[PDB]
Amino acid sequence: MREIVHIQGGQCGNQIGAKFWEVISDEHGIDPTGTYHGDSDLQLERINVYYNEATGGRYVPRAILMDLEPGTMDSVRAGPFGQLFRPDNFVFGQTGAGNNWAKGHYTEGAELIDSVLDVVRKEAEGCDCLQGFQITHSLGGGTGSGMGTLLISKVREEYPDRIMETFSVVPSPKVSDTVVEPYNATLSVHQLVENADECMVIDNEALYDICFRTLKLTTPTYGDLNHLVSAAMSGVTCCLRFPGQLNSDLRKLAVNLIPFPRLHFFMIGFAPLTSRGSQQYRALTVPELTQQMFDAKNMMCAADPRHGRYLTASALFRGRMSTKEVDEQMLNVQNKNSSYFVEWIPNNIKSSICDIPPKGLKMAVTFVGNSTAIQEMFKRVAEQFTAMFRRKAFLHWYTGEGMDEMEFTEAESNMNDLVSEYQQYQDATA
Amino acid sequence: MREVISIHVGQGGIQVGNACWELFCLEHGIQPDGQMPSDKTIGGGDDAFNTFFSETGAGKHVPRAVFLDLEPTVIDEVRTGTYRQLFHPEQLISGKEDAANNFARGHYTIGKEIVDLCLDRIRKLADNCTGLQGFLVFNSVGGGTGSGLGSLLLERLSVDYGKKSKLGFTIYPSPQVSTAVVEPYNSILSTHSLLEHTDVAVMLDNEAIYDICRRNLDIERPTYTNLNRLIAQVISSLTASLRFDGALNVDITEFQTNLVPYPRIHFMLSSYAPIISAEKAYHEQLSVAEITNSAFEPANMMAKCDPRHGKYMACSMMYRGDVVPKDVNASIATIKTKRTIQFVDWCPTGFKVGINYQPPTVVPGGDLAKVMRAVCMISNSTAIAEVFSRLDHKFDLMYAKRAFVHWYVGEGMEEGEFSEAREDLAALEKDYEEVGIET
Amino acid sequence: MREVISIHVGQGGIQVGNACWELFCLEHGIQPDGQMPSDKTIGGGDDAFNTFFSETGAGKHVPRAVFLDLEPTVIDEVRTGTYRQLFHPEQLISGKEDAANNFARGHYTIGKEIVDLCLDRIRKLADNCTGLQGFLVFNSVGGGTGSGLGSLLLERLSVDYGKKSKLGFTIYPSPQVSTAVVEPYNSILSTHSLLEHTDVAVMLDNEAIYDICRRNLDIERPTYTNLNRLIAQVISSLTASLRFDGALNVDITEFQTNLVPYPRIHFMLSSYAPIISAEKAYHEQLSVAEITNSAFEPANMMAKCDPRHGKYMACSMMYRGDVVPKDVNASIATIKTKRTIQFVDWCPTGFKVGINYQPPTVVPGGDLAKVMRAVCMISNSTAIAEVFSRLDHKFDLMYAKRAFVHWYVGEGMEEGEFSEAREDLAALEKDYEEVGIET
Amino acid sequence: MREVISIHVGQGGIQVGNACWELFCLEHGIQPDGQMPSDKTIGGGDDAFNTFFSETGAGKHVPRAVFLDLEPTVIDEVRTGTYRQLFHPEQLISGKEDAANNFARGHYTIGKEIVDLCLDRIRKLADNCTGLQGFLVFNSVGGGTGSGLGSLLLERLSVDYGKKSKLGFTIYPSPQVSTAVVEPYNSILSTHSLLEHTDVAVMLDNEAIYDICRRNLDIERPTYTNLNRLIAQVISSLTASLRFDGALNVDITEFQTNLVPYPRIHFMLSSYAPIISAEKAYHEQLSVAEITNSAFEPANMMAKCDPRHGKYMACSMMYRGDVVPKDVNASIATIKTKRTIQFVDWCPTGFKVGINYQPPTVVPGGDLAKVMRAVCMISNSTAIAEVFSRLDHKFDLMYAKRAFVHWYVGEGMEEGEFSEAREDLAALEKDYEEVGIET
Amino acid sequence: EKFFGMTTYQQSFSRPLKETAHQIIAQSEKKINHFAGTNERPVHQQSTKMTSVLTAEKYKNEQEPKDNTSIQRSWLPYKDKALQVAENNLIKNQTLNQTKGFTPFNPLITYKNNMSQVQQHDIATSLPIGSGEHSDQKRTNQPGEFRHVRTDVTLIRNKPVTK
């Protein structure tokens, strides 16, 4: 039923998936014990997209929990809604990656990836008609950034026709979390451009700024950020799970947003985001949703979208409305912001409609965009990598696992090639 | 004895089919469950329904239509909807994986395992039919499965049956307002396919219907359902001549012999009138002269085309209700006396009129009011080349740098197709601009 | 006063017999216990059931059939099922050891001590009836006891009764779907025995019916019960002419005289139409034209063979319901006009059609719907040699290395039997080849 | 009394000659030992084999072929193959040292010690001939010894015989992929040599027929054997007119008098239809319109050249089977009607059609299926300039840095010889450019 | 936190929202003797839905004169036998329908076949073959209705021993 599987590795991916699954269970009316307690029939005809079925009338998510240390999974199961994931989907190393890309990708990752690949293969073969894969990970860690991308490479080698969609959280230069961040970041993103059909970037700076300035929460935790990420996650596959006037699946998004095979990096956003103070004092309508979803400060990335130009964009309206306002607003915003949209391609805005809004809301908008402003991230990362690498700092830890500087050099050159070919479209005129 | 076979392919095709079959069910008085509520007996000497419905023998009737789509969403929705007892279950052909807005997916990779079943069902449907008149096909062009599968079916029926007439109520994209970005590609490809396979094509873009609803019904929040109802009304008004009385009965054959001077020029844009809500209806005149004059005004065109920028070649006007031929020809003469509509020199007579005696039916919960007179007009004009020119512009500006080409190439599509499609579109526009010259 | 005798040998044979006797018990209104429940039943000349049942002198009725099997489980299941009071206690002959898929076991060692009792039962049942039409036998080829007992009983009957007609509805192994691993051997042996001892042989391959059930009834997991019910329907449609009056009736002697041109060739394959589910029965027309066109579709063959690869020589079609000879003749004319189906040169007319008034009966709790028009079709065609060629390939691939042959030589039969049976099959394929050549 | 002499030079020539002679002997009923078995029906049809063979007076036959090569492995394989019994053991001329893909070695150093014996054998074969039509030569242009010996043989025969007809089936390298690295040099030099020394040349690059066998035969690991099989099938289809009766006969003479507008323009490119996989149960029938449509389909062209980019001069095309001239004429009318096939300005008629009654023979164990109709098309069109342009660009890139030039200077070939080939190829490209322009 | 869930198709057309427990039980008995299949339309019954009683026109009669026809056809030198004939056909058709009972939502349905002058039987210019043996046939579909009867002529027991 054009169903998809989930894979999550590293502690960031584990937390994101933990929140995402309870959001989906809330949307589908699934209790922590795995028994359906919904109200309307509309929650069961597409339940097989995300949940497999088991004896006793219960449902189980088709997600793989992968990591090189058991603490994260010990915490995620000990938390609420831990009963959903089957015990067999847990796979773990015992030494940890040490935030070292080589350890997580070559020494321990290579020897342990057999079991996770086996469970992935059996899960994929169990389903009727696979639609694709979705991945959640961090590029700045060891276990995620290494073994997740290794598994990406293997599954791309094994399943060439299916599509892959990745949610990667990348370092913002302001929040410094690890001193070896650029190394494993580039060694990961070097293999994404050849394998990942869709990559969507997420930033902790962006999440912090949004949660403080729009939501106005004085003491945010990781929970609300995870909730924002989960909402933006669930908005994407809405048309694939619920009826609507203009359905659009992941392959439609890919084909209709990718101009060229090496420009598959996106920035995402969600609407409506409002503070808890004025939840009832504003009107929720298509004009306001459209006005908010194009604001630069609502975007889930540190890059400023008004420093570049949009190539393609997509909006997935949810709820009951009329197409007139939708298309008219898209046309008007394209007309008024002609400077921010590249000119040699006309009508670069995607409109999709699903007829089921989120629980407790009326109309929601998920926005995904490809623009020439995302390369500021890559320029910063490349500059930082060059500054650290020019004297071979921290290099011996990597090289002691059989590593050589030629692959580092070619990955850095690949970054330069990507940024060059991605910025040369900014001034390209027919 | 006389029948027409209906094909609804693509999401837009299915969503138009829903409304048109609702309209037909209401018009013939058949219940949604499919049972005729008795009280139509007494030797019942009229098969007013064989054009669209065929009896099962005792009670219910089934339509002579087939539904095709690759995504099971809308098909399963119809299967679970209020019309679950009406349509034949396995003539609801449902695919498995969406064409993903790509022409190649629907024309070269996934369409083969569906077209065989579709042709088999069309054969089985036609076998029971004894007096088939032709095919009607409803599809959207700016969609992958729509364009590709519609093209493949048109090609297959073109060799399976041949001379049998087929009419296409295609939905081309609007000039500025549209949904996708890749629609020029598959639109050019689909017009390539249908040019040498469709006898008559009708323009049905969306923004014109939007503006019509805004101006006349005064509804500022329209949805696809209203447009579907308008298109359904057009179809019923056109086809009612086969199943109702008239002073001048017109068959579908009076299209490919009266509205198409040349084999290549068979694209027309339609119009419908009157369009009045229930509030302003009782305060108006709604005379034949007024409804005829309002039909020819540019803003009532179903398509975004300005007729004053081109000439007229052939107009077919069907009236239904209590209309009088004296008034009809009086209005026609007044139109001819009026200047701003000019015909081509080599066509001195250019009107074909049909009269039907059944007044239009009104749908509950609908927007239109109950009226005693209505007219449907189909026009062939040389100004239609504007939409083709603008579509060619939108094509080649972004084709110049080869965007999105890999998506088609890697699926199995040869790159050379775009060039020859550009070529025959250029040839067609050349023919249109050549015809418009004076003799 | 006309009766037929039914033989069920093998586990599959007993399972088929259970369903066919359930259908027969229902269609004459016989209660499962065996007695007439209406109590309005009259005497005189209402003894239509005599073709299958016999009056027992006190109350009930006993079927005219015998059950043979060497493995006691299925016979015990019948003796403990819902039909305990129906069958005669000493009419279900049971063995003690199963043949364990070995032909020699059932043809040389064990079957000799059961064949005598079976023959005694046949004789004592036979002198009861006075208008013996013939014998029908059911057996699965790919089973040891089934094949061995079938062969031995056929040889014994051919010399004990002589000219009495024999029809064998045999279950050959499928070309790719099979349970055992040694079925080609005993299939060869059974074919050698059966070639010169049976008057009509009917293919009953399994995967063909599997595909038909999956395609039509929309059942994803049919079991043997559905198979047996369809077989029962086919047999009832075949036999209804002997116990129900009609415009054009046929007899058992009327099929071989019009279906086998030569004594050597007597193998043919069947079809039944229509196969429609309850929900499907509404939204369809169900006319003689479409049912007879469906009956000739290659997917509707009861055996996995494609007639398009061969020629036709004879076919018998029996209609039951409210059909009319003019309509069936028009359908025949359309078939003859059709070019996809072609006949052999020396058979200008190859149709033997019978018409019966009794519509088919429906078993409660079944899958198939009911309509008042049904057709059963028995065609002999040249293409049937394909399955023999496939089974020959299977036999060769394992006889090259003499696999499993020790468990054939160890029960007394010499290794020279394989070569003889192979040569006989090769000659049969030869004959089926030259029979189809043009003069 | 009509015959043709065959020359096979180079390795690819050897493996293609093996295939074509296998096909010829199989078609004419000659066993590999060369002894025609008298047990076959009748025998000795007129003198059908006279075109390719010569009777020994009592016993076997001798093909009119000669094999030339400087590397003994292929000749030894032929002599040790099953065709050891057939060929004359002195006409398989084998050298000692290969040219190692060096044109200078094969044209100036070693080939002079073998060309004398080669021409002596040619004279000996020609003395037997009495009504000789011409010579066929097979060679891969990307091989040093093959190119050099083919050239030398050509300018020798040009003065030895004069106006005698010569047809060369050159194996040109693929546009972008190849196995050689210095093949531009030898290809350009050999083209320079043979531009004024051959009557007909045929383009047979490998990757196009790779695509053909991939798309049509549905084979994903075909080898050079299948490729040679297709080439041999094309050769037999072309040459069947000399040895078998037909409605319209066309000999070797009626090719260069039909396909050659000017003496320099004698390069043609081929296609063949239909190509059907053998591993299919049902083959349907096909017909003339379908086969000609497939033959003129640009992607089915045996050379990697798109005719859509250029204009057509000549099209000579042969049917074999049970074709009807009315069907041929209708197909030609439809092709001329089609817009994508456009002719040059000065060629109102550009079609030659030949008809032969014998269906193509099918080789047992082959990949092709048996079909009762086939067509082989040979075209001369302006689009062939692109391969020369690409080879010119590649050779310019090669010669920019004077790479590999010393290992051609070192065998006595003058340094500036490449410049003359440059200028002549440029002149040929200019001629192609100027021919296509209209007046 | 409410889920809503009334899609556009449902809100536009309907949602069934049915299946009472006894509803299906009551619906069941309809299929006890309802039998899938059909006869054929007997020809000359197929026609367009005739509306006017008068040819090439509306027969519209109404108080206002501009649309009463009979008032508008009165310029002839004589009374046009057509208008009043249609009046008679309508009134006679109403009375005839009264005898049987049809109330077919309008008089126009049965007026198609209330006008035929064809007698039930033949009028002595063709063989009295009747309207067809199949016409006088009635069909039930209970099992065992078409069994043989073995009348006295074929009802023999004793098989006489000698000749």
Ligand SMILES: Nc1nc2c(ncn2[C@@H]2O[C@H](COP(=O)(O)OP(=O)(O)OP(=O)(O)O)[C@@H](O)[C@H]2O)c(=O)[nH]1
């Ligand atoms: N007027 C009108 N147009 C519609 C409607 N539904 C779809 N369309 C048109 O369809 C176009 C896009 O194609 P879709 O119908 O959404 O999808 P498709 O034709 O099935 O092709 P795929 O997307 O590949 O499945 C839009 O541009 C609309 O103009 C409708 O209900 N009314």
Ligand SMILES: Nc1nc2c(ncn2[C@@H]2O[C@H](COP(=O)(O)OP(=O)(O)OP(=O)(O)O)[C@@H](O)[C@H]2O)c(=O)[nH]1
């Ligand atoms: N169509 C059909 N085939 C059956 C059925 N039961 C058994 N068979 C066939 O019988 C074959 C095996 O032989 P069985 O009938 O099980 O047993 P047997 O023929 O008595 O021989 P033994 O195994 O020695 O007892 C299987 O391959 C089945 O194809 C049935 O109910 N329907």
Ligand SMILES: Nc1nc2c(ncn2[C@@H]2O[C@H](COP(=O)(O)OP(=O)(O)OP(=O)(O)O)[C@@H](O)[C@H]2O)c(=O)[nH]1
């Ligand atoms: N069509 C076809 N071409 C072949 C085959 N084998 C070799 N070739 C072509 O032959 C060219 C090179 O020549 P060779 O086959 O090596 O033999 P040669 O022409 O005598 O040259 P040398 O290798 O020096 O002996 C390559 O570019 C191939 O394209 C074959 O089996 N079929």
Ligand SMILES: Nc1nc2c(ncn2[C@@H]2O[C@H](COP(=O)(O)OP(=O)(O)O)[C@@H](O)[C@H]2O)c(=O)[nH]1
């Ligand atoms: N949004 C979010 N980010 C997280 C969470 N946990 C960790 N991160 C981010 O992950 C980054 C560190 O990744 P790391 O744990 O080293 O990756 P790993 O070693 O592969 O598991 C930090 O910069 C955090 O911002 C979480 O629960 N939510």
Ligand SMILES: [Mg+2]
């Ligand atoms: Mg769609």
Ligand SMILES: [Mg+2]
């Ligand atoms: Mg058994």
Ligand SMILES: [Mg+2]
């Ligand atoms: Mg060589």
